[PDB]
Amino acid sequence: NINLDEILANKRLLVAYVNCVMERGKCSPEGKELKEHLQDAIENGCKKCTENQEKGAYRVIEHLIKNEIEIWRELTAKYDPTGNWRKKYEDRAKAAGIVI
Template identity: 40%
Template sequence: MNLELIGITLLCLASVFGEDKYTSKYNNIDLDAIIRNERLLKVYFRCLTEGVGCTPEGNHLRKVLPEAIQTGCAKCTEEHKRGARKVVKFLMEEKPQFWEKLVNFYDPDKIFRERFKQQLLTEGIKI
């Protein structure tokens, strides 16, 4: 299971478009509160996969996620990357059905999966 691209993209959950880096506007989002709350997690999941019920943060993530995946999160700060790793690890271990659907949605041609596989393994995320 290669969920690496979603991890990279979810890193940007707490970000907003910026010129060189995504801004820190959403850095105060409590990722633990989202991933540990089934209702909130489903809200963000539906936003990302269906465009339904999006919060402003979810809408932003939905917009930047494809770019973040394509560029390997080039505009992400270290804080964004830490957050993404946390979310990816949680989804892979606790919600594999969500993870698989996100990966298939954002990388249907499996272009980015291999690109990020080694990076995730290096960061201690088992694929």
């Protein structure tokens, strides 16, 4: 059943997915693969990502910055503790109007 629109539209789906990404909860069939895209974006700026994959990752990255800034602070800290991409994405967000 799981989507990328569902994930964002339903806080529960969102939480499950984030727990899947933080590796502290079970992943759904698709959470399993989506997690790969998101880790890569935060870990290495989506180097290995195909077009769709990059779009989807920034899609949720931006949604975290705007609606779950704490989930975002933990995501980056966990996979990019050296800050190689946290500020680039936050700048892309700000550019978009998302403050803080």
